[PDB]
Amino acid sequence: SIPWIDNEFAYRALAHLPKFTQVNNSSTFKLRFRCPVCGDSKTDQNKARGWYYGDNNEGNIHCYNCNYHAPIGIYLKEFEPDLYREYIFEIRKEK
Amino acid sequence: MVEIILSHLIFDQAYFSKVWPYMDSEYFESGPAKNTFKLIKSHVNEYHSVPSINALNVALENSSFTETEYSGVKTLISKLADSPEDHSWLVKETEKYVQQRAMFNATSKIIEIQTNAELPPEKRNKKMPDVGAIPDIMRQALSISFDSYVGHDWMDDYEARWLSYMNKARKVPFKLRILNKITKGGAETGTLNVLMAGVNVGKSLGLCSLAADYLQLGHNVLYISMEMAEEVCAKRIDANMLDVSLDDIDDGHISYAEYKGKMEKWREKSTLGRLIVKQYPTGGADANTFRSLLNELKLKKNFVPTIIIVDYLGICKSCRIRVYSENSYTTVKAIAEELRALAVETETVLWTAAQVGKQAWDSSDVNMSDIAESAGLPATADFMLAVIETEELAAAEQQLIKQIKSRYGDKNKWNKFLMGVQKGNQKWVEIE
Amino acid sequence: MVEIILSHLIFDQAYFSKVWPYMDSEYFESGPAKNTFKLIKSHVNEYHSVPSINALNVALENSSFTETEYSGVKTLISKLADSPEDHSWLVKETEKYVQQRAMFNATSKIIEIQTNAELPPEKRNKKMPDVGAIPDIMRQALSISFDSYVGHDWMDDYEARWLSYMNKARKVPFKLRILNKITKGGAETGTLNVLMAGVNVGKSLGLCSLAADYLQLGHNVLYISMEMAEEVCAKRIDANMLDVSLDDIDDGHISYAEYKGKMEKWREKSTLGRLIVKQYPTGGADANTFRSLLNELKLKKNFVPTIIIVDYLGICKSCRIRVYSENSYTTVKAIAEELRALAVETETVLWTAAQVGKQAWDSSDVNMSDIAESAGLPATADFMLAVIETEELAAAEQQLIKQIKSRYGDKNKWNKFLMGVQKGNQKWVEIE
Amino acid sequence: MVEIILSHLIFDQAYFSKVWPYMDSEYFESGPAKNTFKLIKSHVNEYHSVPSINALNVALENSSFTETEYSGVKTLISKLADSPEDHSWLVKETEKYVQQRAMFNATSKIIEIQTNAELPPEKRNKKMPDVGAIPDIMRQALSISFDSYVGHDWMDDYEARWLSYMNKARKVPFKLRILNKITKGGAETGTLNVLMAGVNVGKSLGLCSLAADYLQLGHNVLYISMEMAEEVCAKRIDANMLDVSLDDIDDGHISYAEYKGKMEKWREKSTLGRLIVKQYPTGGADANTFRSLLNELKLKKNFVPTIIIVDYLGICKSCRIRVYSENSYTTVKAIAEELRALAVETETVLWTAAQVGKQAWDSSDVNMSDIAESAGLPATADFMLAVIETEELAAAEQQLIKQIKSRYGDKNKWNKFLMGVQKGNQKWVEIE
Amino acid sequence: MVEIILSHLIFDQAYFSKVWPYMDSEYFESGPAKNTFKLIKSHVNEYHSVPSINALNVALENSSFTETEYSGVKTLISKLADSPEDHSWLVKETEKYVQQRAMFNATSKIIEIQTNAELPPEKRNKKMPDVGAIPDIMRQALSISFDSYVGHDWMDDYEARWLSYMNKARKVPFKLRILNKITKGGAETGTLNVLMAGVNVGKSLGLCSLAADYLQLGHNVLYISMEMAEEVCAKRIDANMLDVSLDDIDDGHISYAEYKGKMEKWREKSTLGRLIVKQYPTGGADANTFRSLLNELKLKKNFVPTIIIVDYLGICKSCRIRVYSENSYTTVKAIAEELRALAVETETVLWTAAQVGKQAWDSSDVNMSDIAESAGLPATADFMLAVIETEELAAAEQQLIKQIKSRYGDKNKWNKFLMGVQKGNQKWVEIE
DNA sequence: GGCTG
DNA sequence: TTTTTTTTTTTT
Ligand SMILES: Nc1ncnc2c1ncn2[C@@H]1O[C@H](COP(=O)(O)OP(=O)(O)OP(O)(O)=S)[C@@H](O)[C@H]1O
Ligand SMILES: Nc1ncnc2c1ncn2[C@@H]1O[C@H](COP(=O)(O)OP(=O)(O)OP(O)(O)=S)[C@@H](O)[C@H]1O
Ligand SMILES: Nc1ncnc2c1ncn2[C@@H]1O[C@H](COP(=O)(O)OP(=O)(O)OP(O)(O)=S)[C@@H](O)[C@H]1O
Ligand SMILES: [Mg+2]
Ligand SMILES: [Mg+2]
Ligand SMILES: [Mg+2]
């Protein structure tokens, strides 16, 4: 897999989601966001349990509220198809 | 010295020809070394040649590696160089390194096995070998070497073949001359011998007859019965040796005076061994329990057997596989391997009795495609016989032996012969 | 559980007589536990008896330890009580503890051997063994089971074996002379006996006949029905005992007066036992249900059954395997093994029926291979008789019984004998 | 009162004897209580004795749950202590607690089933029971009262048994004299009777004739057709009752006046029940479906059947085995067992049809071994009748009914008799 | 990879002559690589030869590029080396690179076509191909392969095929004149050849004779034995090669001196091959284990065989059959297919033997109809030689060889021939 | 204020 | 990898 293009594409997709924070240390890339599937916690409006982890082989999104866990490609295919088109195309561009 | 090994795999040819078939990915640490070896192995599998530095840098770019893995592999590839040394120290050093890595992997595996065993049921991992499988793993790791024998090479291995021609292995003779004829003098020490038969047709009768015959020859015989009580097996032996029918013993036809007289007459004979019958519950004994029994017999009774007899192979515990984990074939094959290993370790002729399938029951002829529990038993066994007392041999008080697998001689010479089974005395007499 | 082991070493002679043979200072710990065990071992060596708390404390005062170890030993010695736990659990738990500590010590030893092997020859210690000693080291730590019994000897124990020949308490007569003749004194306790036939041939008829015969001998019979109702089977038992008919009961030919008179006359007999009929839904019972039923029967009434009749093993449900987890050869054999284990635990004669495949439903003879369910049932069975009925036999009201698996006696002495089955009375009649 | 229950399970032998057989793991909690009871249950299963505090602590140390669970179990065990109590207050309170917990678990499962069935398919988390078995689960929550029925005693309970012979409410007489004669009073409630004919020989004509005969004898009949429409079966019943050929109805040889007159003449007769025909798609109805049909018939139509008829069991779906998972043998045996369970539950005479093998077609005789889909169906069926038709029999307007499995009487007597089937009127007539 | 491609275009000849026709400017880049390739192509067009580095730099100096383009091209030109990579890997990797770039270009072109299609018709480019041209364009991307070899093309490979007929590229001679006569020059590679042995003929004598003949002709022979050990088969080989009788070795007539002298005399000859004997248990070697054996021999022993001789086809086990019947037709047909597939995929001559039909045993003439394996062996066998040993032939030390199936040549040309079998030396000699 | 597989 | 039912087919 290609991790840096997943980090670049994931950011824009999760940028729309509110409570968006870039948890980027010296060796990891994570994105904190409110989960778009369930709206995160109904009682707490300030909780952002949706996370993106891009330091692995494949950048994966995981929600700690509704237990959603998916790759960034499936997330883009299911929710942002205009962003999904360029995402799968840019793969061939660099490969 | 992983860097040296990789460098001389890439830049040297005699070293590659000598060490490559024995290298494995598990011998390298999970860092850059294992990934670099993966690239080299993939290139060799795809092109049947040793890759260059350019080939690997192309393979690295065309790889699904993380940034850390990519950087480590690139640094390791950059660090590789052809240091001139001797092709007699490199090979031995590589062999030492591979042996050390194999021992390390075996130690980690047995530690994981012991950790898995102590876990409670319904949470412990399945298909993972039990504690009793630990020594066997440690026996495999010590066997790693850069020398491999695949088949017998004519004109390259002919001294050993001449030795095999001139020399003959020692044999523990039977008392029945027909078995000596079909085995060229008897059975060897480290062997697993099986007497397959149908249900209620004489599996224990033949084993008890063999035990009596060996006891009359001065051997120390251990009869491990997994299905019958100790008194029942000893009564079979008494009927064999005291020439009194089991009906006579049960009905009380023989008196205590005659029984004691016959027992003392047998005792006074110098050509007599010691027979010890040990009973275990069904599925409650394994090879390690047998080793504990042997240790206590040696320590507390000064008893070292030669003719260890197991009543039934299919009942004993696996000792390598957890109970109710694998299928019958795998479990029975593991039991056979463990029993043969025990026989080799103790230098004892081991005799057992498996059960044939339902098809072989009341069938005038049987073959290797009749074993019920496992067809891998003949491969593990060293001599295998059958019992074919189906319909009319019982009326004639006789039997039949197929000789399914005979490693001592040739099975197609006296393949089928008739045995005079006498069930009252629980013995085999010869038709001659 | 070192505290429990030490407490029951000091305060229990039965525990000391089975565990002290197999106990070492390496098994316990490196701190206060090892020092306490060393004090116990020193005291038992100097004086051949188990020490007391006062004697142990005096020895601790005599022996020399540093301050920390002295405090630890005093604290541990203070914590010793009788605590009469179960003996079986205690010995099993101490065996497990010894095995796990021995495995830990063996793993540490082989790790030390491997670490010493990598050292240069000048630096390495000559006391530690080579790597080639790794496997057997791991094997001697897998043969430390607690078992001091070695087994029979056939020459040192022939008096005890002859005395065992006179113990006929296991036999249970049949009330039928032919069955006693072919079983050499009837069935034995803790055995799985099977009565197999085709569909609608008289399997439950034979089971009820055996129940009535055992009832008339004074035994306690527990009939477990799996298809019929309790009142239906009791009707068959009434037809056997009162000896009138099955149709006459349902056709009103029996006046209440006669029924009451016959029942009271049978009550007056002192040779009559107790019969309890229990029904279960198909596929909903096994030994686990049977053991709870046994406990409830014993609690509610003074009823400990000597005979346990199961209407059919197939209709029964295995304990571990689910309703349809595996095929017939497994779960049927599992149910057979569980029933035999229940019988040998309760020391009761277990009777059950078995079905025959369609190939022998209309044949003049039936073989052991004609078992509808798993062929493991004719491996756990002990006296598997067979019922064969033809048109000529039904004309004479004489079912043929063939001896299929005879573990008690000679299977071929009286292989086929005719019975006098009366279907109206649900009774087997011997033929003379 | 979980602490009291556990404490008296530990420190009371009398309490353990009665409460234990019934105690289950789902009656305490999801935390410390369930873990402590699991420890106790494992110890009991391993040693058949009540563990002590030391044994519980040892098992706790050899357990794999987390720190919170370990601390909770340790506190709960430390809190266990025997108290001066009386057997009655404890048994009654335990019964109340167990009943309350059973009701709570039942209603939680009912809510889970309701909230699971209200989900889109393919995402409904299969292996969860459907809403149809919502009340049955509640029926299991009420059948827990510490009062398990040990069984029926032959001598202690015989007045109640005798008040079941002249009752005769179990038997439902036929209308044909020969069928009553062979069954000695007709079929019995809670049974499974079967017709085996082949393909296009009868076997639904016979079922319709039985339905008509029962309907004439003041019975409520529930015909269930898995392979024919509701109007075809009703047309067959009309042809049987009105004595008008099926050809006459097809060819319009009967007027509306005659049809109306015959129907009203039948209606005005007091000796006539109600027949209801229900159609299900092939393979789309099971025992649970039939129970739902029974409930909705009782409620909506106040119709309580006694002669429930199913056209073909082989065409029905098992309510336990997933479709096409097990072979024909297991699936058909399970379906027949479930149908018999339904029949005994609702106390109705259940009639069904079964196919024979291809080899039995166009044969002058049909044996029991010719059953098509399973050999277990004859074993799990109270009565079976074989319908045989040859060219000579067809030319004589007769069929030979052979008694294959006759559980109500002796099958050898009157094994084969010739019925006068009239195929035009879908009626069976006798020849006597 | 582009750097390597350009470097080996500049500094190689075979690579250039192989990959230049399939090299385009659009395959490289839009930057320095494209400019460098344009310079190379311009130079090769103006001067039909590969440019040198100095000439390339002169062309770059006399070219129209900007500052950044000049720097990029200069750096890339300075970064090209004459390093020696292997040709096969280079061609395969540049083919993959070209294919990937062509696919990317085609995908971009079709995306651009679709984007232009969704534009105001008044406003679009005319040069852009229509949407209907999309499937063809991708086809041109998929039709890119440096070397097209899909099967044998008639009229396009006739010159290569003629070189096969003249050079007899497929034939492997027999060393026996008669066998070469009837095979038109011996057996062929990728074939399965079997011998049919009538009653009284051994199957391993002929196979050992063929193995010895191939060994004397320089071929690598892999002899896989089933019913015999490696030493026994190699002893048969020694009997044939050293002219020593088989019984003389066992008796001890031949001493170590003569044996070693003959072996070293054979080793001196340069016309001798290698024989590797591998033993497998009966039924424990399918034609997938042989693939693993070949892989191990190639990797470790560097032994790549040209002749593979299996001791007996019947003893082997069919792959993907999960069964091993002693004498079943389905297995023999599958075993033959698997062995012939192995021969085809390994380009080796495969030999095996089978037993003829019992009728074939009695009759001196053997018909394809008279074969134990009917329609299974005379369907997957290129050559099936039949061996007949009657009393008169045995008295004359001869065996009648009959040709039952000859894919090689006409079966009826020389069907019957007499062979000089020597059973002591296990040899076949010709008859004048 | 983070936490998955 | 064996085991057992049922069927269908085919080969001897
Ligand atoms: N007490 C006895 N008296 C006479 N003959 C006996 C007696 N017990 C067994 N036999 C005979 O001995 C034969 C062989 O019995 P076994 O030795 O138990 O064979 P088996 O294979 O061990 O039977 P298993 O273990 O139940 S499969 C039986 O078939 C009987 O004919
Ligand atoms: N409409 C009809 N008119 C006259 N005769 C009929 C009619 N339908 C059926 N029959 C006769 O009734 C015989 C048996 O009918 P069925 O009861 O349907 O047979 P069947 O065994 O139920 O069919 P299957 O294969 O089990 S669904 C046939 O062989 C016909 O001779
Ligand atoms: N009510 C009855 N009156 C007379 N004879 C009967 C009666 N019930 C059964 N029989 C006879 O009993 C014989 C077989 O009895 P069963 O016990 O039913 O055989 P079984 O089927 O092997 O036992 P099951 O299936 O567990 S009830 C039948 O062949 C009938 O002849
Ligand atoms: Mg036995
Ligand atoms: Mg029955
Ligand atoms: Mg029908």
Author numbering:
A (entry chain H): 3 to 97
B (entry chain F), C (entry chain E), D (entry chain D), E (entry chain A): 1 to 432
Please quote the paper that reports this structure.
The T4 bacteriophage gp41 helicase and gp61 primase assemble into a primosome to couple DNA unwinding with RNA primer synthesis for DNA replication. The domain architecture of the gp41 helicase resembles the bacterial DnaB helicase13,14 with an NTD and a RecA-like CTD that are connected by a linking helix (LH). The gp61 primase is composed of an N-terminal ZBD and a C-terminal RPD that are linked by an 18-residue flexible loop. Here we report a series of cryo-EM structures of T4 primosome assembly intermediates.
